[PDB]
Design a protein around this ligand. Structure first.
Ligand SMILES: [K+]
Ligand SMILES: [K+]
Ligand SMILES: [K+]
Ligand SMILES: [K+]
Ligand SMILES: [K+]
Lengths: 90, 90, 90, 90
């Protein structure tokens, strides 16, 4: 489960990185950062400048938000929770 | 279900597109983009400049956030999930 | 239920409106807008300029996010849902 | 439960405060503010300027969002809810 959501999230972020670096002309790291803060809904960066970028982002949000949060919901409930929960047992 | 949330989301976005292009003077694509990143709570664009825009946005958020995320919750759990889940079966 | 969350949300927003208009010197409408986009996590406006504003905002987020989304979760599931659901019945 | 999520959230925010003040050169209060609005997904501030800051933020979001919202979900359902719910009983 976690591993699958892990791969699915990675692929989604790779696509975004490739897209924004190419179409919005961002350095790969900045393209990855934008992809991440967009799908996690933080949105702390300026928006895309091109219409292609705006259209892709709209679709990217609708298709990727569900996945990204599904992964986060498991990364903290099925991986981070035990490490602390079990450790909370003397 | 999915089709209904599909239509409801579309109509909500159409209203926002019409509103922001008219009142905030945005090009349709930019009006749609603002509507989308606002309802999905990304919020990566500058805020509305007019008081009418601010008031509408406040109401738009409260009335549209629930719907938009309801659609996303189905688009990934009742449409994207199987495609990958079933395919995860050798 | 809905009415209680309605009042609780209103009071929370009134406090924010009073706070930001006074401490950050915002016009009431802008103070309300900031309060709304902050608690709904849209965050499309610049951040507070004063330390008092930053501290209050941190506490305001932790105490108000839960309430605001609780209200939204009811406004769309216990009020907007039927209007369309029942109407979806020929 | 609440106390544990309380401590876990505090530690997470302390790490962010130390990180951003050091690497992004922010005053402690601003470092804390950025950490808070990032993990709660408000994202109303400009993004990190350094690559180290961008990389850390990406990891910080994925590891901290789950925890922070877990704490919020309890702070309003297991602490703020009763205070008003029980009080809603004549
Ligand atoms: K946001
Ligand atoms: K959310
Ligand atoms: K958000
Ligand atoms: K934002
Ligand atoms: K901004």
């Amino acid at each position: 489960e976690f591993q699958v959501l892990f791969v699915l999230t990675i692929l989604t972020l790779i696509s975004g990185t490739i897209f924004y670096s190419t179409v919005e002309g961002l350095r790969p790291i900045d393209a990855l950062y934008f992809s991440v803060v967009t799908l996690t809904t933080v949105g702390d960066t300026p928006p895309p400048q091109t219409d292609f970028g705006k259209i892709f982002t709209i679709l990217y949000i609708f298709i990727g938000i569900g996945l990204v949060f599904g992964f986060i919901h498991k990364l903290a409930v099925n991986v981070q929770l035990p490490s602390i929960l079990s450790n909370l047992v003397p």
